[PDB]
Structure formats: C-alpha cells, structure tokens
Amino acid sequence: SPARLLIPEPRAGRARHAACVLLAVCFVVLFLSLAPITRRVCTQLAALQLGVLLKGCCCLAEEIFHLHSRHHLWQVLCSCFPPRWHLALLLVGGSAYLDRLALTLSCLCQLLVLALGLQKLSAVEVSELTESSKKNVAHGLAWSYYIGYLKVVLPRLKECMEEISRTNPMLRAHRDTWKLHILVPLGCDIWDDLEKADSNIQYLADLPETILTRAGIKRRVYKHSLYVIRDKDNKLRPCVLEFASPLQTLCAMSQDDCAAFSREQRLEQARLFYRSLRDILGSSKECAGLYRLIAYEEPAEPESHFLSGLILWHLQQQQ
Amino acid sequence: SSPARLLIPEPRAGRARHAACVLLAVCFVVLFLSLAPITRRVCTQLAALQLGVLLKGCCCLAEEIFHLHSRHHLWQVLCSCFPPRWHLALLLVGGSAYLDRLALTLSCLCQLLVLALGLQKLSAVEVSELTESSKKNVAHGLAWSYYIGYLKVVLPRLKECMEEISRTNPMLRAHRDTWKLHILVPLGCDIWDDLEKADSNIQYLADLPETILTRAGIKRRVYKHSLYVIRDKDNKLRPCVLEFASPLQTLCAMSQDDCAAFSREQRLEQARLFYRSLRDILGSSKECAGLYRLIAYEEPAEPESHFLSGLILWHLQQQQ
Amino acid sequence: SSPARLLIPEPRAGRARHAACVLLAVCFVVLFLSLAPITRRVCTQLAALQLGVLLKGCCCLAEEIFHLHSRHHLWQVLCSCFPPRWHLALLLVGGSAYLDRLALTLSCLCQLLVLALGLQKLSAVEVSELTESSKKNVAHGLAWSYYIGYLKVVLPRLKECMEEISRTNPMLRAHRDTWKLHILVPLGCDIWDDLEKADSNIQYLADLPETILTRAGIKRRVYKHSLYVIRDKDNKLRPCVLEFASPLQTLCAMSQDDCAAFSREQRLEQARLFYRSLRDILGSSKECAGLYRLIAYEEPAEPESHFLSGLILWHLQQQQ
Amino acid sequence: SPARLLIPEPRAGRARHAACVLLAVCFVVLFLSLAPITRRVCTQLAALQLGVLLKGCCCLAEEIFHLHSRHHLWQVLCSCFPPRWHLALLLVGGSAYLDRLALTLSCLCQLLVLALGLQKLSAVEVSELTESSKKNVAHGLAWSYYIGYLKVVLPRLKECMEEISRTNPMLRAHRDTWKLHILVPLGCDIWDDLEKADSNIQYLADLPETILTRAGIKRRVYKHSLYVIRDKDNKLRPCVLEFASPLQTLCAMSQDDCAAFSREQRLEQARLFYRSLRDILGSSKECAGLYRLIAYEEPAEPESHFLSGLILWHLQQQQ
C-alpha cells in the first residue's frame, strides 16, 4: 500500500493477567521469611470497602428527585449501587464482629476523598468507555439529521409558502403556523400516510418543487406535503407534517440480526435522540423559528383521534 | 393543558457533592463533641488508598506499551495512563515511608487484590451520566445511519445497474472481478465535488443525469452510479465506480459551525472511529458480502500530485 | 351474559413465595418465644443440604464429558453442569470443615443416596408450569405442522408426477433410483427465492405453471414439482428436485418480528432442534418410507461460490 | 461430505451409573476401618426429606385459588405433592419413634431455602427438559399459524370487502363486524361445512380472489367464504367464518400410530394453543382489530342452535 495506514486496534484487556502475576509475586514474596495477620489483612480490606456504600447513599440522595421521571421504586435502590453490594456489608459486619476509632477514621477519610473528588478517571478509561459503547446512536442521528436535512430545507420554507399564500386566502389567514411540524413518537412506528393513521387528517396537495443544483447534472429535489386537519365545528386547519427519518433508522436497525438491538434500549435511544435534537435545534440561529417538533407515546386505550387532537393543540399554541 | 404526557429526563442537578459536604460537616461536628497522633494514621490510610490509582496506572501503562506506537508514539503513554492528580499520592507515600514494611505490604496487597479481582465496578447511575454527558460521539450513529440508509439499499442492486452500463458500452465487460463499489474515506475531512479534478489520471466514462427526489423526507432510490476511468501507465486503462463518505462531509460541516465547538483533533479521532465502526459493521453483514471495497488513506506530508490515482490502482491490482 | 361457559387457566400469580415468607416469619416468632451454638448446627445442616447441588453438578459433568465436543467444545461444560449460584455452597462446606469427618461423610452419603434412588422428582404443578412458561419452544410444533400439512400429502404422489414429467421429456428415465424429493434445510435461516442465483450449476428444466388455491383456510393439493438439472463435471448432467423448508422462513420472520424478541442463538438452537425433530418424525413414518431426502448444511466460514451445488452432487452420488 | 455436520445426540443418562459407582465406593470406604451410626444416618436422611412437605404445602396454598379453574378436590391435593410422599412420612415417623430442637432447626432451614430459592436448575437440566417434551406443539402451532396465514391474509381484508360493500347495502349497513371470525372449539371436531353444522347458518358467496405473485409463475391465490346467519325474527347477519387449521393438525396427529397422541392431553394442547394465539394476537400492531377468535365447548345436551346463538352474541358485542 502506497499510503501506510496507522489505525488503532481494540485493547485486549490484558491488565487482568498482569495484575494476577504481580499478585502471585506478592504472595511468593510475603510467604517467604499467622492467622492474626490474615485477620488484620481482611479487616484492612473491609476498611476501604465501605466507601461504595457512602457513594451509593450520596447518589440516592441526588437521584431521589429523578426517581419519578426516570424510574417512576426498587429500581432506584438497585440502580444507585453496584449489584455486588452485599459483599461490603458482609465484610464490614465480620470486621465489627471480630473487633471504633479506626471505623470512624476510615469513614471520615473515605467521605473526604469523595467530597474532594481526587479519584477521577484517566485518559485510558474514558477512551475505553467511548470505544466500547457501540449503541450510542442518538447523537449521531441527531447531528446527521440536522446537518443533512434541516440546515438545508428549513430556511427556504416561508418564501416557498408565500407564493401559494398569494392565491390561496386560507393559507394567508393562518400566517402564524407556517412552520414545519416534526412528528417524533417515542416509540418507532411510522405510518405510511397520515390519512389512515387518523381519519381526521385530510391530504390536500404537495408544495411546489424545491430545486438545488449540484455540478449541473445532479439535482436535489425536495417535496413537502401540505395537509388539512379538521378541528371541531369551528374551521379547518392547514399544516405541513412529516415524521423523523432517524426513528425509521432505529426501527430498521432493531430488526437487523447482527445489530442485537432490543426494544428496551430502543426507547432510551429514541428519547435521547429527541432530547439531543431539541438541544441542538434550540441553539441554532438559521432555523430559529422555522420548526416545531411534537413528541408523544401511543396511548394504551386505542383512541381514534388522539394524534389529531395533539396536533390541534400544538397548532393552537402558536396563536 | 396537554392531550399527551411526557416525562423528559432532565440531566442530574449534581447535588451529590452537596450531600457529601453536609455529611462531612456533620462528621466534623460529631468529632467536635466528646487525637493529634490520629492524624498520622489518617495520612497513612490516605496514602494506602491513593496508591491504588498508582497501581492501576502502572498496570494500564504496562498494557498500553503495545499501543504506544499506534496511539501516543514514551512520555505520552505515562501521561495518559496516570491521572494528573498523582503528585499528592507520591507525597503521601513518601511521608508514610519516612514516618515508619508489613503495613505497606498488606495495604498494597489488599489494593491490588481488589483491583485484580474486579469486584469494584460502575453502577447504572455513573455509566448513564457518562453516556448522556459526552455530547460528541457521532461516529457510531453516523456509521449506522450511513449503512442503513445507503449501503443496505444500493449495494445489492449493483450487478444489474452495471449490467445495463456494460450493455451501453461493453468496455468494462472484460473486467468482471472488479464489479464492486469503491468507497474513499480520507482520515481528514476534505471532499472533492469533481473527482476528475482531484487527480489528473481520473476521467469520466459515463454519467447519465439523475434527480434525487425526497417526498416528505422519504428519499427515492438511486439507480445510477458514476463510472470512471483511471489512466494507468502507457499500457492500458481501467474503469471504476467511486464514491466518497457523506458522514465525513457531516463532520466537516459540524466543525464549520461555531455553536458545535468541534475542533480538529476531535474531528480526526471521530473520523478514525467512524472508519473503524463502518468497517466492522460491513464486515459482519450478509447482503453486502463482497460488493464493496472501502479505501482509507491519510494525506502525505510530501507533495505528490498523483497519490490517489496510484493508491486506487494498487487497490485494483490487489483486487485482481 | 354469554351463551358459552369457559374457565380459562390464567397463569399463576406466584404467591408461594409469600407463603414461604409468612411461614418463615411465624417460625422466627416462635423461636423468639421461650442458643448461640445452635447457629453452628444450623449452618452445618445448611452446608449438608447445599452439597447436594455440588454432587448433582459433578454427576452432570461426568455425564456431559461425552457431549462436550458435540455441544460446548472445557469451561463451558463446567459452567453448564453447575448452577451459577454455587460459590456459597463451597463457602458453607469450607466453614463446616474449619469448624470441625464422620458427620460430613454421613451427610454426603445421604445426599448422594437421595440422588441415586431418584426419589426427589418434580410434581405435576412444577412440570406443568415449566411446560407453560417456555414461550419459545416452536421446534416440535413446527416440525409436526410441516409434516402433517405438507409432507404427508405430496410425497406419496411423487412417482406419478415425475412419470408425466418423463412423458413430456424422457431424458430422466435413466436415473430411476433417484425418484425422491430433496429437502434443503440450512441450520441458519437464509432462503433463496430464486434457486438460479444460489449457484451457477443449478438450472431449471421444467416448470408447468400452477396456482395454489386455498378455500376458507383449506389448502388444495400440489400437482406439480419443479424439475432442475445440476451441472456435474464435464461428463454429463444430472436432474434433481429441490425444495426448502417453510419452518425456516417462519423462524426468520419470528426473529425479524419486533414483538417476538427472538434472538440469534435461540434461533440456531431452534433450527437444530427442528431439524432433529423432523428427521425423527420422518424416519418413523410409513407413507414416506423412501420418497424423501433431507440435506442439512452449515454455511462455511470461507466463501465458496460452488459449495451448495457440490453438496447436492455428493448427495446424488451417494444416492446411486 | 463437503460439510461435516455436528449434530447433538440424546443424552444417555449415565449419571445414575456414576451415582451407583459412588455408592459402592463410599460403602467400601466406610466399611474399611455400628447400629447407632446407621440409625443416625437414617435420622439425617429423614431430616432433609421433610422439605418436600413444605414445598407441597406452599404449592397447595398458592393453588387453592386455581383449583376451581384447573381441577374444579382430591386432584388438587395429589397434584401439589409428589406421588412418593408417604416415604417421607414413614421416615419422619420412624425418626420421631426413635427419639425436638433438631426438627425445628431442620424445618427452619428448609423454609429459608424455599423462600430464598437458591436451589435452582442448571443449564443441563433445563436443556434436557426442553428436549424431552416432544408433544408441546401449542406454541409452535400458534406461531406457525400466525406467521404463515394471519400476517398475510388479515391486512388485505378491509380493502377486499370495500369493493363488495359499494354495491351491496347489506354489507354497508353492518360495517363494524368486517373482521375474520376464527372458530377455535376446545375439542377437535372440524365440520366440512357450516351449512349442516347449524341450520341457522346460510352460505352466501365467495370473496373475490386475493392474488399474490411469486417469481411470476407461482401464484398464491386466496378464497374466503362469506356467510349469512339467521337471527331471531329481527333480521339477518353477514360474517366471514372459518375454523383454525392447527386444530385440524392436532386431530390428524391424534390418529397417527407413531405419534401415540392420546385424547386427554389433546384438550390441554388445544386450550394452550388458544391461549397462546390470543396472547400473540393481542400484542400485534398489524392486525389490531381485524380479527375475533371465538372459543366454545360442546354442551352435554345436543342443542341444534348452540353455535348460531354464540355467533349472534359475538356479533352483537361489536354493536
């Protein structure tokens, strides 16, 4: 190869073997040249093993607020501590039974270490955490969707709508709702059309063509569909509706055999994608007021006009 | 109010530190009620707890010796393995040694036994916080989105498109073992719109007009790929089907934005990670078993006017 | 109300654990009413009861040494033979040994005596719960449904259909000893809709068009089978009848289904179990005595373009 | 063979011979180098034979609620305990006759083990139990029926019925009952046609062909029969009726000599098939409301209009 590529390889995780061999060297050194000594060693091991309890208590105190939003109660208790938590309890109980200045001194120094935060993570640990997680797709989908589509199609919407508003008085009447409505259900189902998703949604027509030139032979053509949705017996409301492609990407990736993408983590990925897309769209100056994305979950009771009511509420919010 | 109901998990308020501080104040208040030499024991225990990260850093550098040349190229390896907050650990160890080695032996034994056994792991809270706090990890998402959107829909329908192409001109019918789409992924982010201008030996052979249509966000399938001709030495000419990586253009555009605050070294790292992720995703696929060949190159320091053409010709030669 | 009267057996609420807990609380309360050395006796009895699972695991590994190469290939055998929650049994055994070996000998003798006589067997409730709890055991059901629906109605009427086929073209009268349908069952789940694109040596010879009609769920019989020709070496050609397995398509669709939550390891296990069940069902039949041949293959790691046709050619050579 | 296959073989069950040789080894070891010792061994053996009694008692306590549904009373007592339960009673009686703290300690230990449930099953036992059951075809039949037939014929029903409806006012009037009515009798008898099964069911016509193209020469064409049922002296009701093929499969394999498929457990298999089909149909988003499976048991008195009244009730339920 003319270009000698230099690509990193995944770490083999051989630090365990080095730790084991140095531990064996430590044994062979200590044995050459004693039950109370072993008891003291066990007590010392139990001495620094109680900091996990303090860290878990602090995390629980900090996370009791988000308990309702994330875990709605045993999940909160089991999440704030590692699954191997009773071992520390057994060790501290054994140390107490065998024997309190040392205990309170150890608690004080451990809590001081926790407060000062001098036990941080080096570069290798954070690098391994970034490399290992192969399912953090939400940020990628958010940035890709933004840059690829919204940064290039959103600004040329008011000018594309004003020409129709010149001849159609209905569009001129509803001037405050000329934005693009993004449908992002927290699940992953995508309806083929919005006419059969809800009987209260009526298709009207497609917006005029959007022409982009690329080298003069390649043309990027964008189509938007304008819908009319019927409220109660007051009037008819027009709007432009479409779903989010990253949701379709997640849905198609879940069905893949080599992806190993389950359903419990797909919901988390969709939620993270929605949050990231909102956070990156809210700080954009190009599409400052050219968008409104609506998020929902399908109700347990199959109401036939739930989505339509949500869109009507959202449309009435602008006025 | 709202027909639906959403519970958006806003990020942590970071009040765990406040709880630790108030507990520490309570501990001082308790110690005030109801001494001096105990400070020596406290310092020795602090040194014993601090030497654990030193042992972990030593093990990490021992494991990273092999990756030294690939990533860091000697001081960089030890700087990365050891957390910068380690001078105070050395000071504490020196003070403990001067103050006094059975205690040190048992302390280090316990520390490295805990480290080797691996019974101290991360609970859900901290791993979730790390997952949701690192805002820039677009490599895996971009790789998956690119694969699903493009590489899983046009690669299977590559034999027939080039079959009609060869029907138009039988010149490429002679070459049958190089009937796969070539992908160029520069480890930087430069993308040439006119690939004929990148190198003087790459010339078009067939590019029929085609319009890319998206109806309400649904992109229409692509039925044509641009056929090229890379001029070899004065012996023959060879055709190819060439493409660039759109996610690299996404990285470039993200780096251009001021609100993104996306730098150059991070861009290089994300590009390399995207390359690795895409290679691993395509390696374990079934529909795209052998209908692709992705070429990764890093632009050379010395100015060469015919670097890319030679590289693709070499890739074609190994393809044969 | 309702004209019918159905008492469906809804699944159990799992309230036996609550009964165990309340009886444990009652026993604790009773022990509180009306001492320390009794804890040692309790621990010894617990260790004596716990060593039974260790003995069972030893017997299981002794039995599975033979099947190690067939299923697990050595740590996998040890992991399967023993329950994961086995460390505490060893801890109890070590504690009992440290506290004290006639008692250990008699306790282990009693435990292995119980294991040998097999007087500890599951009741009706436990086996019923185990049968009704496994929601993914479709191998036997799919095998039986395939056999009854398709394999029992078309195979007996196979000589005569190929008799009219030979009447149309008599080239196949020479191969009189291969008048049996070939079933292709890959242990994976990939299915080729068009058998031409699977291999270059498989060519069609005769497809008389036929419409498969089902009236109100009742499927009509099949009066035509698709005849193929397999290209051997440069000596002659060989005709064949090929067909895949629909239950493999069912497994593939179950895996692709979102609400099924059906993984890949389970898919391979179910495919192997389905193949074994189908082979055992067909081998003990009377109508299908010698009018079938099922070919099971695993896709090779190395890519080969003429493997499947070669395997069919080997089966035809051995069929002579 | 080009691909040497590695297929598992049934386990020979030779762990029992290992247990027997261990019996012999332990006996010859203990004999080398004692009536009270034998009595103590018998007492220890009786000590751990008492846990099955507590297991049966807890099972009876948890199953007294399901007794009416599953066993309708001696069967409840016999099912919750192993048949070889009198042996434990004999051993405990002998231990009591030979001889109180030890019994209470053993009972407490057994209760603690049962409550914690640390005596679970390893991988080999569950694999053997999943391989041994060659008759559990309920789940397989349900999944096969679903994927093969319902996921392909159910979606193309409303559109197939609209064309007939637009010319027949009878179909337009009854629009809420355009589902597919699956008949799943808990028995196994399948009528050749519903005309002679009940005198109140009248055949009307066949639905137009559902044409599916495959490779251009293979055509999967479908027929569905549309019936009309005579209610009381009010009106007539049209519906699409059919039986469930897996019941026919069970009936066919019941008659097979090599199957050894009896009749007592055929009812249980059909019932489990019904429950599994209901569970896997109620959670599907494709056939949300395009079906209604009806289950019944043949009454003792051979009424001539039992099934018709049931379909009339199930049809009035939508209205």
Swiss-Prot record, chains A, D:
Main localization (coarse): endoplasmic reticulum
GO molecular function, one term: protein homodimerization activity
Stretches of the chain found on the membrane's Cytoplasmic side: 1-14, 64-83, 117-319
GO terms (BP aspect): activation of innate immune response; autophagosome assembly; cGAS/STING signaling pathway; defense response to virus; innate immune response; positive regulation of interferon-beta production; positive regulation of macroautophagy; positive regulation of type I interferon production
The reaction(s) this protein catalyses: H(+)(in) = H(+)(out)
Secretion signal, residue range per the UniProt entry: none
Post-translational modification: Phosphorylation by TBK1 leads to activation and production of IFN-beta. The phosphorylated pLxIS motif constitutes an IRF3-binding motif, leading to recruitment of the transcription factor IRF3 to induce type-I interferons and other cytokines.
Residue ranges the record marks as coiled coil: none
Similarity comment: Belongs to the STING family.
PANTHER family: STIMULATOR OF INTERFERON GENES PROTEIN (PTHR34339:SF1)
Protein name: Stimulator of interferon genes protein
Swiss-Prot record, chains B, C:
Record's bilayer topology term: Multi-pass membrane protein
Region (Cyclic dinucleotide-binding domain (CBD)): 136-320
Residues the record lists as binding 2',3'-cGAMP: 145-150, 221-224, 246
A Gene Ontology molecular function term of the record: proton channel activity
Annotated InterPro entries: STING, STING_C_chordates, STING_C_sf, STING_LBD, STING_TM
Location relative to the cell: Endoplasmic reticulum membrane; Cytoplasm, Perinuclear region; Endoplasmic reticulum-Golgi intermediate compartment membrane; Golgi apparatus membrane
Cytoplasmic side: 1-15, 65-84, 118-320
PTM annotation, UniProt: Phosphorylation by TBK1 leads to activation and production of IFN-beta. The phosphorylated pLxIS motif constitutes an IRF3-binding motif, leading to recruitment of the transcription factor IRF3 to induce type-I interferons and other cytokines.
Keyword field: Autophagy, Cytoplasm, Cytoplasmic vesicle, Endoplasmic reticulum, Golgi apparatus, Immunity, Innate immunity, Ion channel, Ion transport, Membrane, Nucleotide-binding, Phosphoprotein, Transmembrane, Transmembrane helix, Transport
Catalysed reactions listed for this entry: H(+)(in) = H(+)(out)
Residues annotated as transmembrane: 16-32, 40-64, 85-98, 101-117
GO biological process: activation of innate immune response; autophagosome assembly; cGAS/STING signaling pathway; defense response to virus; innate immune response; positive regulation of interferon-beta production; positive regulation of macroautophagy; positive regulation of type I interferon production
Positions on the Lumenal side per record topology: 33-39
Pfam families the UniProt entry points to: STING_LBD, STING_TM
Chain sites annotated for binding 3',3'-c-di-GMP: 145, 150, 221-224, 246
Keyword Transmembrane helix carried by entry: yes
Key word Ion transport present: yes
Biological function: Facilitator of innate immune signaling that acts as a sensor of cytosolic DNA from bacteria and viruses and promotes the production of type I interferon (IFN-alpha and IFN-beta). Innate immune response is triggered in response to non-CpG double-stranded DNA from viruses and bacteria delivered to the cytoplasm. Acts by binding cyclic dinucleotides: recognizes and binds cyclic di-GMP (c-di-GMP), a second messenger produced by bacteria, and cyclic GMP-AMP (cGAMP), a messenger produced by CGAS in response to DNA virus in the cytosol.
Domain remarks: In absence of cGAMP, the transmembrane and cytoplasmic regions interact to form an integrated, domain-swapped dimeric assembly. In absence of cyclic nucleotide (c-di-GMP or cGAMP), the protein is autoinhibited by an intramolecular interaction between the cyclic dinucleotide-binding domain (CBD) and the C-terminal tail (CTT). Following cGAMP-binding, the cyclic dinucleotide-binding domain (CBD) is closed, leading to a 180 degrees rotation of the CBD domain relative to the transmembrane domain. The pLxIS motif constitutes an IRF3-binding motif: following phosphorylation by TBK1, the phosphorylated pLxIS motif of STING1 recruits IRF3. IRF3 is then phosphorylated and activated by TBK1 to induce type-I interferons and other cytokines.
Name of the protein this chain belongs to: Stimulator of interferon genes protein
Protein's organism: Gallus gallus
Primary gene name: STING1
